[PDB]
Design a protein around this ligand. Structure first.
Ligand SMILES: CC[C@H](C)CN(C[C@@H](O)[C@H](Cc1cc(F)cc(F)c1)NC(=O)O[C@H]1CO[C@H]2OCC[C@H]21)S(=O)(=O)c1ccc([C@@H](C)O)cc1
Lengths: 99, 99
């Protein structure tokens, strides 16, 4: 699929047996998901964005199927206003920008 | 250009006679540039992000040359940590996501 940017680049993702909508975000280095029950242990981490910082739970080697394409990587869970798929996962499914 | 996402997709911009680097950000609805001296009027605005909100100056009908491509739209100026080109202008340069 080729995606235009006239609307929010939202895809349906499946993570931890749950279905969600996430924003394909080329400006995000890592993936940050709203509060959700992720399996396993975690590590506290702090990440910064517009308006300040948030505390997140870092889960490593998490499976995540973005638009039918499978990827495993680090997922951060915390008080983000939107689920964002970052470059750590976009690279694994071959997503590219074109203009 | 087709851009891979193994590194941040940072591109050159020309705005107000000034040269800057900006991030092609599909997760941003609007364009937000780091603090810079822009000519003309503006209106007070507040914008939200991962960590919260910041107050910015909204400028309309501002010309920007993103990696040699010309576009006119709304530019927000404020305490953002990075210059980010949002979808309001990405559509103007024909930017698409591809996977
Ligand atoms: C410093 C570089 C930029 C700002 C990083 N960010 C990516 C951006 O794309 C971000 C995505 C976004 C979309 C939302 F709908 C809600 C939201 F809270 C965040 N957009 C954003 O703030 O845009 C502004 C302007 O347009 C408006 O629309 C959306 C909100 C407004 S991040 O998310 O802060 C971030 C990502 C990863 C990491 C670590 C884990 O690697 C840390 C921080």
């Amino acid at each position: 699929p080729q995606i235009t940017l006239w609307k929010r680049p939202l895809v349906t993702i499946k993570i931890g047996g749950q279905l969600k909508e996430a924003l394909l975000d080329t400006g995000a280095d890592d993936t940050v998901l709203e509060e959700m029950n992720l399996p396993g242990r975690w590590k506290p981490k702090m990440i910064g964005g517009i308006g300040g910082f948030i505390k997140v739970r870092q889960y490593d080697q998490i499976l995540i199927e973005i638009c039918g394409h499978k990827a495993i990587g680090t997922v951060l869970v915390g008080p983000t206003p939107v689920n964002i798929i970052g470059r750590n996962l976009l690279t694994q499914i071959g997503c590219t920008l074109n203009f």
